Design a protein around this ligand. Structure first.
Ligand SMILES: Nc1ncnc2c1ncn2[C@@H]1O[C@H](COP(=O)(O)OP(=O)(O)OP(=O)(O)O)[C@@H](O)[C@H]1O
Lengths: 144, 806, 48, 107
């Protein structure tokens, strides 16, 4: 769903067609949810699924997600951002530094299997890449 | 506290047995200690509510209630005619021990906040049947009334065979044989006439209901066949019940609701007759003593008896339908209890103001233990306890019970909860929005927006808030133990909302709206009432004049108003043993002080009350009159007799203006002000009143060291209501001389800034203690009774306001 | 009398059995009632 | 005029005698009901020898009347107590004093 939404953001024509199709069909997107970007099913589905993706990453990964969004603003390619995060490993958030990360890590550990997840650095970097790209494109869309 | 003499006096110690006796007729309350009489009684107290046994204590005790019967064996025989209390337990409920008006309790997941409890009133035990005597049966109804009454006897006899009953010369439940079962004519005619008249009463009560019944089809009476009854169903006498049978008959839903009302009226009428005879309620049946378990109004009656009575009436209603007479259910008559104010009844719990948040994204949860009326949301720090949550602009809340969002009014939103549902409240001050989730799912308005409120102005911050209606329970989780939150992970965690108390070291303090009326200064911005401080001219003394701002205009508020002066006058510790210009020696020596009240023309003296109130006056009564005033007489005497003393205690000492209004003037609006003067002698303890110079017959006596506040209770009926006049009479000192020490000898009237008018306010904020006494209540045994225990000490630092004795 | 006073005091609580009796004209309730309390243990000064 | 009223029973046999140290807990209140002193707040029993004229006269008589283990209320008139002078800062002039005195032991 994220990749589809990134395609939506990148291609201007796809937005043209979704608007034309919704208008012509006269289909009511609000009926499905319960014309506009928020009503656009392409955006609504990603908004619904986004918490699932964020659940993938860990609170320490948030520090890296910030820098990944910065690179995506710099317009670096996906693999370029992956390599940037690969070389910028030590930038991972520190639990001791901030109190909030303490209780966030408490939850992260309490939920089973998440400690096993993110053990390998490569999965960490790919996960941060994906979530960061999705969030960056959400930022562009929400922007006028 | 008044000392009372008893043999071997001592503070209640282990192995002491205290016997309490209540006689409502006198009324009086008496005590016995270890069987020995306690030489003192309470009497002449008010009877406007229900009385219950109570024990008050601090930490460090174990006691046992002994209620007689199987709930505690009395150590001493009750005095003659005194019923054991265990009998008083109502049919619906079982006996146990309770706290009194608790605003919270414990529970497995945490502390539960509790709303007010609906409580019975002494009037609730008075049966109030609708009178059918005025009604006269229709001629057609006369024809059915008789045969139906005979059929009803046959139905009862048929039920009796199911009961296993057999004809008996004397009826014994153990015997299983009943003389009451006989053919209508076999049954004694005075007994049969009672059945016939009762069936007539049912037609008449249908008329009272207003349902209209005209017999429709004759063939319908032919269609019904009386059920054939077996000899086994027949009594030992062999009288056989012959109830008619109407399988075809069916009851309309409006008609089924009608059958409930008729049964209720029938139970209510039966109770009235038994009371007139002299019967009374008792959990244990005592026929010789005329004590019955059934003798309670229908609503209080137990459900099983309700359904039995309803079945009888339903069968009789169906028999009426079976004859063919059509009964039209009467239109539903509107009736609203309107017993209380919504805001003053529902209790509001909020966080302490210091916790108000002005930025960030915050989350908390509220589980509805009951489905009833509750509101949950965010409130501004300067929230008012009187107003209902959301009616004003200071609170944004959600009332799931009906499915509404409340702010400056109600708007449909969301869906109602069920028992055990958790509402997650989120506030986002970065975006200025508020969100509600039910069981982890965002609640959506009809328009489809996922934000309950938008364009929130941060202002002074927001606090968690919840309101509970009567008989409601809610578990509020501000999220100190993040793992305890139920749906935070499902919704609110990934979005970045933080539990309201995530990093707090101690549980968040809360305040509740305590509905104990307290006197407070009249607000300077009050829309309805204004107080003007008038300077004292040469001819007029200092005054405090009250006027109604909005009188004579639509939206004006007219209700009883209780006013007092901010400072008291205190009687001396020890009472004395046994021109128009004041004389100097007399004015210096006098211990009498005076103040008056001027009721302006056009204000009803019948609506005015004038006098004094003691510090512990907390009655906010819209229907106030001198009969409501609390009062009780403590009488102390020797065991042989010879009452030593009798002291009358009250919190209100006032005279009614109707007493002073002349009989001719009564019913007519006078054009002259009424001046009522109040005199108190601090050394003597005597209180007198005068009306327009003349002396009233009312006088009061108070004990030494008492504090009295000047007070006026008035129902406004004019733009200018009343005036507190702080002056003097010849050779009598003004009130300021008593109020202030520096002016003790100054005879010039004056009203310093501290002296102001205060009005009774129904509700006020109060702080919930962080810890509560741990009381254990159980039943030690059938012989031992019920046990109360509290062992762990608990103390607080109390701040005392000397003038208000609070 | 002028300055606010402070002191430490014990918390106090009340307990009742769910028994209610009153008097009203035509009321079904009985008039006279009786009950007892037996004191098993008391600590005269558990605190100050 | 000191008036003694039993609150809890004592042995009824042991009474303080001159030169014998009395150990007590007391809580003092003014007649109108304000508390000014309390040994329990300090958490240390008050000790005094009878006849030393070190406690006030109302106490002398009241404790002399009490018996070991007894708890009593002593109402002490002004002229028995500090009296017209009073205790500046603590007790107003001409104030009757009510004490809740328990006599723990004699030594
Ligand atoms: N409260 C009542 N309302 C209406 N009918 C009643 C009521 N109590 C009894 N009856 C009926 O009155 C008739 C006589 O009463 P019943 O045979 O039950 O006599 P009882 O057992 O001596 O007295 P009770 O049952 O009233 O204590 C029976 O038909 C019974 O069904």
């Amino acid at each position: 769903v994220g990749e589809i939404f990134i395609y939506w953001s990148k291609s201007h024509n796809f937005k043209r067609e979704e608007q034309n199709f919704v208008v012509q069909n006269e289909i009511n997107n609000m009926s499905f949810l319960t014309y506009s970007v928020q009503t656009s099913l392409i955006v609504a589905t990603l908004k619904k699924m986004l918490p699932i993706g964020l659940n993938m990453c860990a609170p320490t990964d948030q520090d890296l997600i910030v820098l990944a969004k910065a690179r995506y603003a710099l317009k670096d390619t996906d693999e370029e951002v992956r390599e940037f995060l690969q070389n910028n490993l030590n930038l991972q958030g520190k639990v001791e530094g901030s109190p909030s990360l303490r209780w966030q890590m408490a939850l992260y550990r309490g939920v089973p299997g998440r400690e096993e997840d993110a053990d390998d650095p490569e999965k960490i970097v790919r996960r941060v890449q994906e979530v960061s790209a999705v969030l960056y494109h959400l930022d562009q869309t929400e922007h006028p | 506290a008044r000392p009372v003499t008893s043999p071997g006096q001592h503070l209640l110690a282990p192995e002491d047995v205290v016997s309490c006796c209540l006689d409502l007729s006198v009324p009086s309350i008496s005590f016995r200690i270890n069987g020995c009489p306690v030489q003192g009684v309470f009497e002449s107290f008010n009877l406007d509510g229900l009385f219950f046994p109570v024990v008050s204590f601090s930490a460090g005790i174990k006691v046992r209630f002994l209620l007689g019967g199987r709930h505690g064996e009395f150590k001493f025989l009750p005095p003659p005619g005194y019923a054991p209390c265990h009998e008083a337990v109502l049919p619906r409920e079982r006996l146990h021990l309770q706290p009194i008006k608790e605003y919270r309790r414990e529970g497995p997941r945490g502390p539960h906040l509790v709303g007010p409890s609906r409580c019975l009133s002494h009037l609730d035990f008075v049966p109030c049947p609708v009178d059918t005597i005025q009604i006269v049966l229709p001629p057609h109804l006369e024809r059915i009334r008789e045969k139906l009454a005979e059929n009803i006897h046959e139905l009862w006899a048929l039920t009796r065979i199911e009961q296993g009953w057999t004809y008996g010369p004397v009826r014994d439940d153990n015997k299983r044989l009943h003389p009451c079962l006989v053919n209508f004519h076999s049954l004694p005619e005075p007994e049969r006439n009672y059945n016939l008249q009762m069936s007539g009463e049912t037609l008449k009560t249908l008329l009272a209901l207003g349902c209209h019944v005209g017999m429709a089809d004759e063939k319908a009476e032919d269609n019904l066949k009386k059920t054939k009854l077996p000899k086994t169903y027949m009594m030992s006498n062999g009288y056989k019940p012959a109830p008619l049978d109407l399988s075809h008959v069916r009851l309309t839903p409006a008609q089924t609701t009608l059958v409930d009302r008729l049964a209720e009226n029938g139970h209510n009428v039966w109770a009235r007759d038994r009371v007139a005879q002299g019967w009374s309620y008792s959990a244990v049946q005592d026929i010789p003593a005329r004590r019955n378990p059934r003798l309670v109004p229908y609503r209080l009656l137990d459900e099983a008896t309700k359904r039995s009575n309803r079945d009888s009436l339903c069968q009789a209603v169906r028999t009426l339908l079976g004859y063919g007479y059509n009964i039209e259910p009467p239109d539903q008559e509107p009736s609203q209890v309107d017993s209380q104010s919504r805001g003053d009844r529902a209790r509001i719990f909020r966080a302490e103001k210091s916790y108000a948040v002005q930025s960030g994204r915050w989350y908390f949860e509220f589980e509805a233990v009951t489905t009833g009326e509750m509101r949950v949301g965010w409130a501004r720090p300067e929230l008012r306890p009187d107003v209902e949550l959301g009616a004003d602009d200071l609170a944004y809340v959600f009332n799931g019970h009906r499915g509404q969002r409340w702010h400056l009014g109600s708007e449909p939103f969301g869906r109602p909860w069920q028992s055990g549902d958790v509402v997650g409240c989120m506030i986002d001050l970065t975006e200025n929005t508020i969100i509600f989730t039910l069981n982890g799912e965002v609640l959506m308005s009809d328009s489809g927006s996922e934000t309950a409120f938008r364009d929130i102005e941060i202002g002074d911050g927001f606090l968690p808030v919840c309101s509970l209606g009567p008989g409601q329970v809610g578990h509020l989780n501000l999220g100190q133990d993040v793992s305890s939150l139920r749906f935070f992970a499902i919704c609110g965690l990934q979005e970045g909302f933080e539990p309201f108390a995530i990093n707090m070291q101690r549980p968040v303090t809360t305040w509740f709206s305590k509905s104990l009326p307290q006197f407070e200064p009249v607000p300077l911005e009050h829309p309805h009432y204004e107080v003007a401080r008038m300077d004292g001219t040469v001819d007029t003394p200092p005054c405090l004049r009250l006027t109604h701002r909005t009188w004579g205009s639509q939206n004006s508020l007219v209700e009883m108003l209780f006013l007092r002066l901010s400072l008291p006058v205190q009687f001396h510790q020890h009472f004395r043993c046994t021109d128009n210009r004041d004389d100097p020696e007399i004015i210096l020596n006098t211990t009498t002080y005076y103040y008056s009240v001027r009721v302006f023309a056009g204000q009803e003296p019948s609506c005015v009350w004038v006098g004094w109130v003691t510090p512990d006056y907390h009655q906010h009564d819209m229907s106030f009159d001198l009969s409501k005033v609390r009062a009780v007489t403590v009488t102390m005497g020797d065991e042989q007799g010879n009452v030593h003393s009798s002291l009358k205690c009250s919190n209100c000492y006032m005279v009614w203006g109707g007493d002073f209004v002349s009989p001719g003037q009564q019913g007519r609006i006078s054009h002259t002000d009424l001046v009522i003067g109040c005199l108190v002698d601090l050394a003597t303890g005597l209180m007198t009143f005068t009306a327009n110079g003349k002396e009233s017959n009312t006088f009061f006596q108070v004990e030494p060291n008492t504090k009295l506040f000047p007070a006026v209770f008035v129902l406004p009926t004019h733009q200018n209501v009343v005036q507190f006049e702080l002056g003097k009479q010849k050779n009598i000192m003004p009130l300021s001389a008593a109020m202030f020490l520096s002016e003790r000898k100054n005879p010039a009237p004056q009203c310093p800034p501290r002296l102001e008018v205060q009005m009774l306010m129904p509700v006020s904020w109060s702080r919930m203690p962080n810890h509560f006494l741990q009381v254990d209540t159980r039943r030690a045994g059938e012989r031992l009774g019920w046990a109360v225990q509290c062992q762990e000490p608990l103390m607080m630092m109390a701040l005392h306001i000397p003038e208000e004795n609070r | 009398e002028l300055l606010l006073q402070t002191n430490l005091i014990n918390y106090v609580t009340s307990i009742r059995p769910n028994i209610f009796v009153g008097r009203a004209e035509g009321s079904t309730q009985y008039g006279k009632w009786y009950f007892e309390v037996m004191v098993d243990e008391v600590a005269p000064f558990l605190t100050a | 005029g000191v008036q003694v009223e039993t609150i809890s029973p004592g042995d009824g046999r042991t009474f303080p005698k001159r030169g014998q140290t009395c150990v007590v807990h007391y809580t003092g209140m003014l007649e109108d009901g304000k508390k000014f002193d309390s040994s329990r707040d300090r958490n240390k029993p008050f000790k005094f020898t009878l006849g030393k004229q070190e406690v006030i006269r109302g106490w002398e008589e009241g404790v002399a009347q009490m018996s070991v283990g007894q708890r009593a209320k002593l109402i002490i008139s002004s002229d028995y107590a500090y009296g017209a002078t009073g205790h500046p800062g603590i007790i107003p002039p001409h104030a009757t004093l009510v004490f809740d005195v328990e006599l723990l032991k004699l030594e």
